[PDB]
Structure formats: C-alpha cells, structure tokens
Amino acid sequence: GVEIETISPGDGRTFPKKGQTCVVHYTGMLQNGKKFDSSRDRNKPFKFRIGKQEVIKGFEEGAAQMSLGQRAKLTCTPDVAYGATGHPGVIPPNATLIFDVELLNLE
Amino acid sequence: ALSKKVKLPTIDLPIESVSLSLQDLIGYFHPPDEHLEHEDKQNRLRALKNRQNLFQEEGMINLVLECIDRLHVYSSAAHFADVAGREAGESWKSILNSLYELLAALIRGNRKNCAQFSGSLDWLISRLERLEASSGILEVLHCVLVESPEALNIIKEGHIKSIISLLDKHGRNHKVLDVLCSLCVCHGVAVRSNQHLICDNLLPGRDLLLQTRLVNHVSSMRPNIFLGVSEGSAQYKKWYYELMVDHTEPFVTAEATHLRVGWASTEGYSPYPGGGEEWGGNGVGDDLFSYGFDGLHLWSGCIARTVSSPNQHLLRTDDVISCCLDLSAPSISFRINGQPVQGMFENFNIDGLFFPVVSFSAGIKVRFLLGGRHGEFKFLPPPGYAACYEAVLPKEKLKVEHSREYKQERTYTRDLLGPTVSLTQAVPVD
Amino acid sequence: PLSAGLFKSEHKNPVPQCPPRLHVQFLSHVLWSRMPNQFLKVDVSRISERQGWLVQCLDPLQFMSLHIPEENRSVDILELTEQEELLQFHYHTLRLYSAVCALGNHRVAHALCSHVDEPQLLYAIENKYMPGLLRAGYYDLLIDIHLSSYATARLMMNNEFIVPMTEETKSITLFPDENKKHGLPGIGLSTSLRPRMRFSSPSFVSISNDCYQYSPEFPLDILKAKTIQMLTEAVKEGSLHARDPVGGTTEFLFVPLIKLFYTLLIMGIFHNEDLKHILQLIEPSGLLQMKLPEPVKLQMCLLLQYLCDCQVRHRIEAIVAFSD
Amino acid sequence: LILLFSRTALTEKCKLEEDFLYMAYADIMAKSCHSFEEKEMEKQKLLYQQARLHDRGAAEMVLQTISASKGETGPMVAATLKLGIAILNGGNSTVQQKMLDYLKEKKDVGFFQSLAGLMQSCSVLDLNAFERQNKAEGLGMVTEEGSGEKVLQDDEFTCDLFRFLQLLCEGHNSDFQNYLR
Amino acid sequence: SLQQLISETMVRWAQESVIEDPELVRAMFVLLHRQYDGIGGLVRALPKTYTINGVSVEDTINLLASLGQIRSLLSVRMGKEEEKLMIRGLGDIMNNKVFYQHPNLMRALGMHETVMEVMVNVLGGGESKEITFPKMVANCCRFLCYFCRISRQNQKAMFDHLSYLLENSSVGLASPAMRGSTPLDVAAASVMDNNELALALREPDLEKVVRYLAGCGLQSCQMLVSKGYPDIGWNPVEGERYLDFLRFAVFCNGESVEEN
Amino acid sequence: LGVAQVGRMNFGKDVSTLKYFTICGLQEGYEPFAVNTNRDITMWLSKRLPQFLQVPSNHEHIEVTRIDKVTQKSFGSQNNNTDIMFYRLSMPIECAXXXXXXXXXXXXXXXXXXXXXXXXXXXXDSDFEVLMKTAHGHLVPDRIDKDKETPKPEFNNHKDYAQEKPSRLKQXXXXXXXXXXXXX
C-alpha cells in the first residue's frame, strides 16, 4: 500500500537488505501538512534495522525500496501505518501518513 | 402547580420577591475584599465559613438544586412567558443566573460541602449544555473541582468528553482550559487516568486547540518588467527567460528550502499583487495571483500538483529552467533542462501586469538569464517567445526590486511609503 | 445530512441546530500588520555580469506562527501582543500542556513534544519580542516535559548522604580551608550516590516502544550555553534599568530565566568551569546588588539554598573521608 | 519577622502546625534575653534587651501563638512559653500591662480556654509506668527514656507554663489577678 | 565567605523595604538562620548519612532507584497501573541484598514511613464500605512485616506507628486470602518476641482491641451472610485474629508478661 | 502617508542622528520616545488585504440577529449610503479525497455553473449582498437530503450572490473577473 515519490535520486545502486541497519533522516507529517514528527529538529539521524519489526511497515517496506542518498516521499496507508486505532494522543484513527525520508548511510 | 398541568393561575409566584431575596443572599456570602486589614479579613472569612456550614446543615443546597431542576424544564424566555406570564418569562434567565451564583458562593471556599454534594456532578455536567447558564455551571464545576479531590474520583470519560465537546461547540473559552487544568491535578497530586483521557481526547485531531509551527522566512525577487495585453498596443504576447543556480542546500537548518520560480499577476494595473500579506512562508504559487514551479509540483493558490517529467528532481545545483509565457490562447510553461514539463496553468485570468519572479528562503545562489548584456541563454527560445531585456520599455532603466515594498535589512532609515498610482499609463484624437 | 452536522464533532444528529461558533463574518478593513524586526538581507551582485543577473541569500531566518484551523489562517507568534483573546487562550493552552504532564508522566510528555516541537521551545526561550505570558508558558513547558522528572528525582534524594569508601572518595580529606582560602561552593569532587539520568529518544515511527520510562531526550549542552548567554545579557540589561525588558515587565524577563537556570543547576550540569563562571556572574565583590522584584529574589533564595546544600554535602563527604 | 509570626498565628486553621521556622526563632529570641552597680547595670540591660523585642509585637505574638493552639501540648507552645518567660523575666509591669490591654481590647476566649486545656493535660507521675520501667531495667539493660523515663512527661513544659502564669501576676498586679479569675 | 554575603543580602533587603508575599520573607529568614547556626545542618544531616563500601555500588544504586520510584508513585493517586508499579518496586526492594546487609540504611532512608504513608492513602476513603486495592494493602503489609522482622530496632520503629494501624486493623479480615499480610499481623510482628516492647505496650489500645473482640463476638460478618453462610450469632474469624494479637501481646519468650 | 508619499520616522536612540533635538527639547526636560531601549520598535502599520472579521455589536449600518421550526440568523441595517458586503460563515466545510461536487438549487431545481472540483479543500459558505434600505436576506441551515444552506433573499434580488469560497481577500464590486486557473 505504501508508495514512493522520488525527490532527489541516490544513484540507485545500494539497496537495503535483510540483516543490515539504515541511517535515515526524515520529517514525517500528517495528510493535512501538519508536521507530527521529524529527526532534523533533534539533530540526530534515525538508525534502524530492516526486517526486525521495530518501525512501521509503511516505513520499512518503503525504505527497503530506496537507495543511498536518495530522497523520497513515502505515502503510507492507515492500515499499514497504525490501523483503526492510530497512535494514542498524536495520530487520529484512520489517518494517512507522509514521510520525507533521506537515506544518509546504509550499513 | 403550574408545571404539572394546566391549572387555574391563582398561584403565588413571588418573582420579584425571590429575585430580591437571591440578590441579598448572594451578597450575604460575598468574600472579603483583598484591600482589607488582615485581622478583619480573617474574621469575615470565619464568619462566612460558619454561615456556609449552617446553611449546609439544613440541606438547602439540594433545595436550590431542585429549584434549578424545576426551572430547567423550559427552553427560553419566550417558552416561559406564554406559560407563566411575561414578567416571569423575562425574569427566568436572571433568576437562573442568580441561583447558579448562589450555588457557587455557597461552596466557594468550603472543603466539606464539595465532598458532601459531589454526588450531584452527574447532573451538572449533563445540564452543562443548556446554552444559557453554561457559564454558571462551569463556575460551579470549577469551584467544586479545585477544592475537593474526592470529586475527581467520580469524573469518568463521558464527563471529560462532554466538557471537550462543550469547548468545541461554544468556541475558544479560557475557562474550560482552567477546568481541565484542575481536573489534571487537584492538590499537589495528579490523576493519570484524567491526564491520559485529556491527552487522548483533546489534541489527537489538532482542530483544537490552536496549533503552531516553526517555518522559514521566504522572500522574492522580480525585475522591472510589466506585461499588459488588451486591444490596442500589444507586446507580441510572448516572453521567455532562463534561470540557473550556482549553489543550493536542501535542508539548511530544519526544513527544505523554499525555492520556486514563475510569473505573478497584479491587482488591476498597479503594483502590490495580492497573496500572502507580507513576510510569511508564501512565495509564488501560494496564491491565486502567481504561478510557480519548483521541480516536482506545480503551485497555484497554495495547492501543489505533481507533474511528470524526465528525471523529475528538485532544483539542485547547476540546473537550468526556462520559463515561457504566451498570453492569449496558451499559458505559462516551464522546461527543465530543455525538455518541457507535462503541465501548465491554462485558462487563467489575464487581467494585470505579469512579471517574472523567483522566491527563496535561504542558502541559494540564483542567476536570471536573458539576452544581450544582461546574460546569455543556455537553450533556444521557442519561435515567437521574446525576452525581458526586450520587454523593457525603450529608454528606461531595468532593475530588480524584491516584490512589493521595503523588505530590506536596514535601520530606522527606511523610506516608508504610502499608496501609489497605476503608472498613469496602465489612441489619437478624434 | 446537515451543514452543521459536517464541520462539527457529531454527525448522526439530523436536527439542524446552530452552535455559538457559527457567526457571520464580514470582509472588514480594520486590521493592523506587524513589521518584522529582521529581514532576509538579500544582496544583489549589482554588477550585472554578461552571464546573468545574480541574486544571493546565505543567512537563515525562521519564525513561528499559530495556525487557526477553523479560519485556516497562519498568524505570526509576535502578533498576539495586540490581540488579548488569542494571547490569553494560548497562555492557558500552554498551562494545560504543562498540567497534563506536570508530574512524572512520560507517555503524555512524549506526545506533547511532537505536539509543540523540539526547536520551537529554543526559539521561544531565545526570542526577545515575546508577549511575556507566552515566554513564561514556554519556559514552564520546557521545564516540565524534560527536566522536571529528573529534577524532582534528584531533589528527593538531596538530604540523604550515602557515600562509598572508594580511593577516589579518599581524596577530599583536605577540604581546602587553611592557607587563607575557603574554596567555592559546588566546586570539587562529589563521590556521592545520586540517581543516574537517562532520556529516551522521542520516536513515533518505531512500533512498540520498550518502556519510555524516564523522559524525552533533549540536548543539554546547547541549552546550558544559551542559558549562560541569556543570563549574561539579562544582567547587562537590568544593570542599566531600561524601559523595555524582555517580555514586558522585568519579572517576565528574570523569573523564567532564573527558574530554568536553577533547575539546570539542580539536575547535575555546569561542571567546574561553567559553575565558576556562573559564580562570577553574582559573586564579584552583580546580581544580588541590583533592584530585583519579589518573584526574582524569591528564586534567588532557592539558588542560595542550593549553594548551601552543596557545601553541607561537601562537609559531610570530608568528614567521612577523614573518619576513614 | 514578628509580624509574619503573628499573621501565621492569626490565620484561621484547625491545628497549630509544626512551623520549624517559629520553633527555631522563638528559642533564639528567648536566649537573647539574659556590688550594687554590677547588679543594677545587668538589671537595666535586661530591661533593654526585653524592650528590644516587646515593643515590636512579641508580647501580642506570644499570646496569639498560645491562643492558636486551643490546648494541645506540643513543641510550639513548649517554645512560646519559654519566649514568654524570657520576655517577662522579673516584674515587667509594662509587658504585663500590654498583654492585659491586648486581651481586654480583643475579647477572645481562645486564650484562656487554651490555657485551661493545657493545664488539664500537663503531667502526672504514674506509678504503673514507673514500676514497669523498673521491671524492664531488671529484665534487660534497656536504655533510659529521655522524657523523664516516660513517667513524668514534659515536666519542664509544666514548670514553664506555671512560671509563665506566675510572672503574669508577679508584683501586685491586681488588675490581672482579677482578670485571671 | 558565602555566609558573609548571604547574611548581608538577607538583612539588606528587609532594611531596604517592607516585604509582602510572606513566603519570600520566610525563605529569607530560614536562609539567614541556617547561615548563622551552621552546625544545625550538620546535626540534622549526620543521622541521615551512611557509608557502605567500594564494592557494593550497583545493588545500592538499584535500591535507591526503586525507592525513588516508590516515592514518585506515592506522589500520584492510586490506580491499577500505579498499584502494579508499587508492587513491582516493593518486590525489587525485598529482593535486594542491601535490605539485609545494612538494616540501618533503611531506617536512615525512612522506607517504613514511606510504605506506611503509601498504605494510609489506600486504607483511607472509607472505613466499613470499601477495602479496594487489597493486593496494594497486602504488599505493603508484608513489606512492613519483613522490615520489622529482620532487625531489633525496626520493631521499635514500627511500634510508634502501631498505635495508628490498630484503629483500622478491622480490614483484611474475614477472608482466608491474606493469612500473612494484614495490619493486625504487622502489629503482632512488631510487638512479637520483645520484652521491652511488650512492657512499653501500655493501655490506650488494649481496651480498643477488647472492644473490637466484643463487637466481633456480638456481630456476624455481613460479607459472610452475603456470601451465603448460615448467619451464626457471632463471628469466629476477626475474633480469632484479635485473640492471636492479644496472645502475642501477653506471652513473650515463654514467660507471661504480668501487667499485660 | 497619501498616494506616492514616502517618509521616515525617528523615535530616538540615535542622538548623533537627531538634528533638532539640541535646538528644542534638550533643555525643557523633553526626552526621545525610544531613548532607554535596547531594541527597535515593532513599527506596526495598516495592512492592505481586508481579511474577514466577526460583526461587532457596536457597528453602525450592519446588525445581525439570531433566532431559534428552523434556526436562522437574520440581518438588518439603518443607513443612507449603500454598498456591497461579503458576509461569510465561520466554520468551513472540508472535502475528502473522493467527494468533490457542489450543486446550487434555486426555488425550482438545480440550475447553475458546474462547480465540482476539489480534491482536498475547505470551502467557506458566503453571500455577497447589496445593501438596500430594507435588507432582510439571511441564511438558514435547512435539510432535505444532505447539507443544505438556504440564503433566503427578499425584494431587489438581482446582484446578490451566494456560494462557497476558500480563503479569498479582495474588496471590490465585480460580478465576474474572479481569479482562476486550470492545471493540466
């Protein structure tokens, strides 16, 4: 369900594989443009493994199709991101998500 | 005797008597003024405390509860007038306000009374939507919540949802927020249940309360070019100009740099086009009087639409864009790296003096490209499309103001200006 | 089914009522705009080279703006100075944001962090043209969401002096008092049991956070440097007694700054040299000699109380070191 | 400081709190106070030390603190009585008259009824507790109880209360002798 | 030289201007008196100081963290999740080894008073109409029992609070779910096997226990008659508990206390 | 300032730049307006774009009431000069990704311009009414099958308009000539 809209190409050579960790830099935002998350504010990139079931599916399946240095706009669906319950306090139920992801390093 | 059924109106309805009695009883519990001696203030406090205790130990708080119950069975002064008389109908509102004020004054300070009658909170929060005494009910709820922590033990999710719906229905009231603050903590101790309920039911949707965000300062640059087409003198209705970039940085501090370029209209035949007022995050495309392009989307009226293009990417360094503008039948078009884009803003209002313009936030080195001594084109203009160095009127200078006004980083020595005229020029004698 | 039943909370009510928010708005002209005090400072090459017209912009500039949703309009933060209603409403909103996470509740703090921002708090505490009430509210929110929990956890164990018998502990046996010197408060070595601090990183893309048990992460070095700089600027401003203190009156300028500095000093930062500079801010014989208001001297009292608590702890540690 | 203590004692409550501030400052203010010229100079310097603080409201502050306890033997009255002793050492007719004028100009019972409630529960030597502690000592080397071996509770407080009642009538102040009856 | 300028400024402000907001002048004067006495802080804090070793650091740090969590949950109203965290923290503190290796440390930290003021919040609210959070009552009861058990001085410490819990010792009875954790049982554990404490147990409460026993022998349990018991004219459960407490109070080390 | 009028203001803080302060003001105890200041003044101005505001009760020639069967918000006026207003409701109706259509049905059937284009927007209800001596035309939230707003007019109804509009800030007297653009 998650889709990818390229913003800046990252030479499309190195792709995330099972058993690795990616360093990303993203500024998530709701469908109405209201920003609800970012990693450039805290000035620390987001490091996460692939296939370990630690981040949302709409993020991991989308990052598994990107390359090093490639900026992408990942549009996810509510069922692949949070479902009919959302995130208590922040994300309302049945809400679509948009992430402006940029891969810095692929380890 | 009047509300039970239709009976003969030989009843004693002391409307003015009970109004005067309530007006006296409200002042009977008036708290002492702060501009008073300490000993006299303490004496008045003790006096009103003893008064409130004696008034409670007779159970008349339940009596005024029954009174407001029997009075709430109507809907408005018009509903009460044709049943109980014109005077009673017009005084029902004042009587209910006085009753709520008395109920609040009976419990302004006591800790025992709130504990005693907290079991009646199921009725107050339900009648909170009476739309005529919501202020009084909210006052009573606030004074009963701020004093007794045991009243918070019976506040359930339905009551919090009712309060939040009241806040959503009656607008932005600074009293509901104090009620919620008192529900969060009562006496140096917090209630995690109520805190979580507030956090999960108040601001997941962001429609309320007032949101906020940190955006960048964007500005725009435009040359001294104006394009007005009508019957009579025309200017070939065809223009073209290129634009390149030297250095660009996608995220300078926290967000992606605003970087757009296009053509902006005007208001009538004068400067100062309409849009984002001034000094915002609005460049070109953020209004119905400008049309811009940033590499991925087409902006028009602060609404972006993605369009396909060979190797569609943001305006990275060393990127050449070419803007073409035909006036009458077709509209503005953009060609990135020579290959044109697959979109344009057809059928738009031609009223106004169009001009090229580029908007940027920070970290940018932009170069306009014209013909002659001003620059050199990178590509070939399509047949017919002229340029701005030829659009300039004969025997006038050509410079670059920002867009409208004195958006210059200067000290107090800024020439602040008022309104202007439509250039006095924007047929022989018979 | 209805107009009112479309832009409100409820939708299953087919009765066409009108809430008090539904009021007609006419296109009016009585409105003031605020000229910003800082611009983008765009510089044209002014040479008009034969290879194009150059425009350059290097310096960055940001600003925060409220977004009224039911009007769908953005308004700069500083424009609330004239509008009494939005000012008071946003002040009470900040108070509610602080109250929902006042005590050691972090499931709500992790949400409130993204609800406002990470760097908007820094911008608000650094900005000079703040309405005062909003400055205080943002200061209190920054104290509550991050520093409050660990501050109280470290203050609860302030009167319990548990000290090990390590060789590093057997080094303060001198507690320099002779040869005509007395040392400095808070300067030296602790070797005392104190609750460790650790903050989790606020991330909402990660499913099933382990515990988020302690606090949201916040950069402390930038915060302490900014606090020192702003406190120096504030004492320099108060020394001359102008008529435009930051945030309106002078208590709005001082009290939140002193409170942030005080909780920072509590939570275990300002190592030897930083605490030395903080001391030379007030000690030279300053801040205690100025004409300070009552809410300001009330915080100065707590500052001096902590300065005495640290000396008492040092004395107890020296007593244990000699008793060994 | 005296005005702060007086306002704290005048604020309506239901139980006199601990008030470590007051308990620490009353002892300092009490210990501040205390061959013919060698006995006259000290007798005059004692009057000077008492005037250093009884013209500033301590004479009424002590009465208010005693009144705000409504008959509860605690470390608050146990210190305000020592303060009264230090302020009324010797036949201080001026302080006696100030207290009497205050009590007559504020017709308060909460002082005399508090004195009665305090006197009703001062201390009595109980034989059962004494023989019980004796048996405990015989059985084991139990450490001695501080408060008079738990057989006479606050004997110092009782002596201070009765010395205060005595100094209030010292000399021949018949006005106060009748006002106590 | 800190006392110098502190004592200068504190008196200088008051000499400059009369001060409203009595909290300000209160803080000013407590700072002043602290600077002048000096040794008051020492005599107040040295009873609360402690030293353990250079090898047992992680254990005592975990103990201090658990105690801080206990105090933080105390600062919040009692709920299900709060009760669960309090139970887990009590478990960790009971499992820690410092709890045995240094019993004076717990008294210096005031763990018994913290647990007591946690339990009083649960035992409040009502007297004979709600005993909600029974696990929350029981965990504190068993913790206090063990604390007073592994000592000789913790029994004397808990004997002070023994007077309070005897007024609400009627809770937790009439149910064979807590034969251990109970306020009456922690009273018995505090008074158990100590001749000095058995003697110092005077009679402001023996008549209270006897009145409770009489009420139990005169009235049956409404809880039992609701559960469906045959409604005997008296109650043999709370009475048996009171008799056990009286036995622990009277008999000590094999020799009956004469006065008791 | 009037048309094509430029100027400059000086609130002080620059005594080296103030010219006629020593000539007058320096001796009679007169001070600059921003002499004891560490930062410049905000320098507020009159904005041009006339945004929407709620009707104040102390506003002449325009009065709005509220009644309540059905709920209505009637109008009224007492004036001698006529113009055109731009009345607008407060809360706008937002459209989802799928829904995108608007039909204007008169007293008879639905006969108007095909205004059915909104992927994701928020239209605010509005009516532009000309001010007669008696202007009782108002808005009524009604119901037939879906969201229905009836802008009930009265006599002299030939130049009053009633539609739904997004954020738009323009003050003039024009029927058409509205801004537009179709993206391809």
UniProtKB/Swiss-Prot annotation, chain A:
Q: How does it assemble?
A: Identified in a complex composed of RYR2, FKBP1B, PKA catalytic subunit, PRKAR2A, AKAP6, and the protein phosphatases PP2A and PP1. Interacts directly with RYR2.
**What EC number(s) is this enzyme filed under?**
5.2.1.8
Keywords (alphabetical) are: Cytoplasm, Isomerase, Rotamase, Sarcoplasmic reticulum
Give one Pfam hit by family name: FKBP_C
What residue stretches are annotated with the PPIase FKBP-type domain?
Answer: 19-107
- The identity of this protein, by name, is Peptidyl-prolyl cis-trans isomerase FKBP1B
Q: Which reaction does it catalyse?
A: [protein]-peptidylproline (omega=180) = [protein]-peptidylproline (omega=0)
Instruction: Describe the function of this protein.
Output: Has the potential to contribute to the immunosuppressive and toxic effects of FK506 and rapamycin. PPIases accelerate the folding of proteins. It catalyzes the cis-trans isomerization of proline imidic peptide bonds in oligopeptides.
Major localization listed first in the record, in broad terms: cytoplasm
Fetch the InterPro entries from UniProt: FKBP-type_PPIase (IPR050689), PPIase_dom_sf (IPR046357), PPIase_FKBP_dom (IPR001179)
From the broadest rank down, the organism's phylogenetic lineage runs:
Eukaryota, Metazoa, Chordata, Craniata, Vertebrata
Annotated GO molecular function terms are: calcium channel inhibitor activity; calcium channel regulator activity; FK506 binding; peptidyl-prolyl cis-trans isomerase activity; signaling receptor binding; transmembrane transporter binding
> What is the annotated tissue distribution of the protein whose record heads this document?
Detected in heart muscle (at protein level). Isoform 1 and isoform 2 are ubiquitous with highest levels in brain and thymus.
Q: Which residues form a coiled coil?
A: none
Q: In which organism is this protein found? A: Homo sapiens
Q: Name one GO cellular component term.
A: calcium channel complex
From Swiss-Prot, chain E:
Gene symbol of the encoding locus: Ryr2
The record's tissue-specificity note reads:
Highly expressed in heart, lung, cerebellum and brain. Detected at lower levels in adrenal gland, stomach, thymus, esophagus and ovary.
Domains as described in the record: The calcium release channel activity resides in the C-terminal region while the remaining part of the protein resides in the cytoplasm.
Query: Taxonomic lineage per UniProt?
Result: Eukaryota, Metazoa, Chordata, Craniata, Vertebrata
Family that this chain belongs to: Belongs to the ryanodine receptor (TC 1.A.3.1) family. RYR2 subfamily.
Provide the function of this protein. Answer: Cytosolic calcium-activated calcium channel that mediates the release of Ca(2+) from the sarcoplasmic reticulum into the cytosol and thereby plays a key role in triggering cardiac muscle contraction. Aberrant channel activation can lead to cardiac arrhythmia. In cardiac myocytes, calcium release is triggered by increased Ca(2+) cytosolic levels due to activation of the L-type calcium channel CACNA1C. The calcium channel activity is modulated by formation of heterotetramers with RYR3. Required for cellular calcium ion homeostasis. Required for embryonic heart development.
Null-mutant phenotype, please?
Answer: Embryonically lethal. Embryos die at about 10 dpc, due to defects in heart tube development. Cardiac myotubes display enlarged rough endoplasmic reticulum and cytoplasmic vesicles that contain high levels of Ca(2+).
Q: Which residues form a coiled coil?
A: none
**Organism encoding this protein:** Mus musculus
The protein's location, in the record's own words, is: Sarcoplasmic reticulum membrane
The protein here is known as: Ryanodine receptor 2
Q: How does it assemble?
A: Homotetramer. Can also form heterotetramers with RYR1 and RYR3. Interacts with CALM and S100A1; these interactions regulate channel activity. Identified in a complex composed of RYR2, FKBP1B, PKA catalytic subunit, PRKAR2A, AKAP6, and the protein phosphatases PP2A and PP1. Interacts directly with FKBP1B, PKA, PP1 and PP2A. Interacts with FKBP1A and FKBP1B; these interactions may stabilize the channel in its closed state and prevent Ca(2+) leaks. Interacts with SELENON. Identified in a complex, composed of FSD2, CMYA5 and RYR2.
Describe the processing and modification events after translation: Channel activity is modulated by phosphorylation. Phosphorylation is increased in failing heart, leading to calcium leaks and increased cytoplasmic Ca(2+) levels.
